[PDB]
Amino acid sequence: MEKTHVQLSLPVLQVRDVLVRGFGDSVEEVLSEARQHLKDGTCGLVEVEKGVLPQLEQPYVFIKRSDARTAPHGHVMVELVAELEGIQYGRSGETLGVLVPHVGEIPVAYRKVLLRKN
Ligand SMILES: CC(=O)Nc1ccc2c(c1)CCC2
Incomplete structure (x- = not known):
């Protein structure tokens, strides 16, 4: 019963601040983990x-x-x-950024997105 899209405000992190530099070890895992962190509010964005x-x-x-x-x-x-x-x-359009775990780093901005929960 999740809607197809969800509005999220993502913290934009500077790369040198990121403590956990990816979501895992395979394509399927990183997509899964990214989705879970997005749902939990624990996902950041690096431009x-x-x-x-x-x-x-x-x-x-x-x-x-x-x-x-x-x-x-x-x-x-x-x-x-x-x-x-x-x-x-x-296959999609232009990159807004690369997602990473957020573990409390201080962002430089917040990026509003309407995420497709594919
Ligand atoms: C209310 C809501 O849609 N939460 C949410 C946010 C992000 C994501 C999900 C669920 C599942 C896939 C990624």
Whole structure:
């Protein structure tokens, strides 16, 4: 009975502050764990710039833009896509960032998203 989309405010973390640098050891695990942390309010977002991905652990979980036609209520519609060894699992739009566990790090911003609970 979960709705197809949920509005979330994600803490945006700087890469060098992140204590737990990924969600696990396989594509299926990272997607699962990312979803669980998103549900629990314990998921952060790192914006991708040069140097960021090499400082994080693969497989990566990205949130990517799902629709251009509109962004309801200020929350960009996004979906999850994992990457391992240059191969992506999911096909979507532009990356908003890479998801990581949040364990109390102080964010630099909050990113409002409307997440597809695929
Ligand atoms: C109320 C709600 O939809 N919570 C929620 C938030 C994020 C996620 C879920 C559930 C399941 C998949 C990821």
